[PDB]
Paper text:
Of the known factors that promote muscle development, TRIM32 is an intriguing candidate for coordinating metabolism with cell growth. This protein is a member of the Tripartite motif (TRIM)-containing family of proteins defined by an N-terminal RING domain, one or two B-boxes, a coiled-coil domain, and a variable C-terminal region. In TRIM32, six Ncl-1, HT2A, Lin-41 (NHL) repeats comprise the C-terminus and are proposed to mediate the diverse functions of TRIM32, including cell proliferation, neuronal differentiation, muscle physiology and regeneration, and tumorigenesis. A single mutation in the B-box region of TRIM32 causes the multisystemic disorder Bardet-Biedl syndrome (BBS), while multiple mutations that cluster in the NHL domains result in the muscle disorders Limb-girdle muscular dystrophy type 2H (LGMD2H) and Sarcotubular Myopathy (STM). Our data show that TRIM32 promotes glucose metabolism through the stabilization of glycolytic enzyme levels.
Causative mutations in human LGMD2H cluster in the NHL repeats, suggesting that this region may mediate protein-protein interactions important in disease prevention. We previously showed that mutations in Drosophila TRIM32 also show progressive larval muscle degeneration, despite modest sequence identity (~42%) across the NHL domains. To gain molecular-level insight into the functional conservation between the NHL regions in fly and mammalian TRIM32, we obtained a crystal structure of TRIM32_NHL at 2.6 Å resolution (Rwork/Rfree = 18.2/22.8%). We then used the TRIM32_NHL structure to construct a model for mouse TRIM32_NHL using SWISS-MODEL. Indeed, the superimposition of these two structures demonstrate that the NHL region of Drosophila TRIM32 is a faithful model to understand NHL function. Briefly, the C-terminal region of Drosophila TRIM32 containing all six NHL domains (AA 1061–1353) was fused in-frame with an N-terminal Glutathione S-transferase (GST) tag. To this end, we expressed and purified His-tagged Aldolase (Ald) or His-tagged Phosphoglycerate mutase 78 (Pglym), both of which were low or absent in control pulldowns. Both Ald and Pglym were found to directly interact with the NHL domains of TRIM32. Collectively, these data demonstrate that Ald and Pglym interact with the NHL domain of TRIM32 and in vivo, a subpopulation of these post-translationally modified glycolytic enzymes can be found in a complex with TRIM32. Another possibility, which we favor, is that the NHL domain of TRIM32 serves as a scaffold for the subcellular localization of glycolytic proteins to limit diffusion of substrates during glycolysis.
Residue numbers in the entry: 1062 to 1353
């Protein structure tokens, strides 16, 4: 991989390499998938929301394992949306309709849960959307509280930031986030049609994009990912596009349109980026994950 020019790789993005899913509840099928994440060896981890489960695939698409079932018990999920994998390989699920986070081990066995519905510190309204920083700190978007709450690996509350509003440092219904290896917190601020970037302590660092349909503009951004150089990847759901941004925030590339064939989307949700430049998009109403 030594001579790779990332910018050139990203600018060639359009044609799907392969896809995953198809409607159903058997292993390898999805129902209305929302969050996805990449794992250690570039594994593809899918929040299979309406099947109340996570499914894990290797970097070439081969199904590996699934875990979870409907419920409010330990290791059960109501209608999960967000998923993530930390450096230790344990699975971190935003169990949306139970208003809690569950952390499972690399084999999908239950380790701990935390949170319940509420506005208070450590309490969530509709969690939807989670990620991990290098030290194992958990960052949640509780969508309906218009904020980001950060926890320790054991669930201990640590801090929070953002609040309802349309201004500097505010959020309206944020769905998805990512933390870069620079420890900048990258929040898709859905209804403000913008990407918000904070440091770990809640200080606004910059803003990417704004409302519109031109290059560099968003209509209801959903999934976000960041690569190891700071390229930012956005599911521009309102405009039926993936957008890619240079590490300085400037528009680089866009691809996709409303549809259900190769490179077409309906209901863009989560987004993830493999360390080889493969972009992963969750295509909710087509019950599939597409890889570019």
């Amino acid at each position: 991989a030594a001579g790779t020019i990332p910018k050139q790789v990203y600018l060639r993005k359009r044609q799907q390499l392969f896809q995953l899913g198809g409607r159903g509840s058997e292993p390898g099928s999805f129902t209305w998938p929302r969050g996805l994440a990449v794992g250690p060896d570039n594994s593809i981890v899918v929040a299979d929301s309406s099947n109340h489960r996570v499914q894990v695939f290797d970097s070439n698409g081969i199904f590996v394992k699934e875990f979870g079932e409907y419920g409010n018990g330990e290791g059960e999920f109501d209608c999960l949306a967000g998923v993530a994998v930390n450096r230790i390989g344990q699975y971190i699920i935003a169990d949306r309709y139970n208003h809690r986070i569950q952390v499972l081990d690399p084999q999908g066995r239950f380790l701990r849960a935390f949170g319940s519905q509420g506005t208070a510190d450590g309490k969530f309204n509709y969690p939807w959307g989670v990620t991990t920083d290098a030290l194992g700190f958990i960052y949640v978007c509780d969508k309906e509280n218009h904020r980001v709450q950060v926890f320790q690996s054991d669930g201990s509350f640590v801090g929070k930031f953002g609040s309802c509003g349309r201004g500097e440092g505010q959020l309206e219904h944020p769905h998805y986030i990512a933390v870069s290896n620079t420890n900048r917190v990258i929040v898709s601020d859905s209804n403000n049609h913008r990407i918000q970037i904070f440091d770990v302590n809640g200080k606004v660092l910059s803003t990417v994009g704004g409302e519109g349909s031109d290059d560099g503009q968003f209509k209801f951004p959903r999934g976000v990912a960041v690569d190891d150089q700071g390229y930012i990847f956005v599911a521009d759901s309102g405009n039926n596009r993936i957008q890619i941004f240079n590490p300085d925030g400037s528009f680089l590339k866009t691809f996709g349109s409303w549809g259900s064939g190769d490179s077409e989307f309906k209901g863009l949700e989560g987004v993830a980026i493999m360390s080889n430049g493969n972009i992963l998009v969750c295509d909710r109403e087509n019950h599939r994950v597409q890889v570019f």
